[PDB]
């Protein structure tokens, strides 16, 4: 795991991460697919609750990304979202 993700993903519980795998994995065929779309990336926060806005998204995708999310990269965006609820 990148070291720096590494203490993103401290923030989360194991369920946590269990129920954000299971809202990533409806985007992926997983059998063969690794990362979701940065249009799906958006569609996958909101499931999971988040409303990022759509210069935040590209702003993510500039300063996460290793045109695409794989699962690591998707939990370092969530985390990061979710500390800008009011
Ligand atoms: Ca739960
Ligand atoms: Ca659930």
Redesign the pocket.
Known sequence: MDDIYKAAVEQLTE??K??FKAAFDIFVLGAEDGCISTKELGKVMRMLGQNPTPEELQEMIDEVDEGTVDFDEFLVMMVRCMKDDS
């Open positions: 369920e946590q269990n129920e």
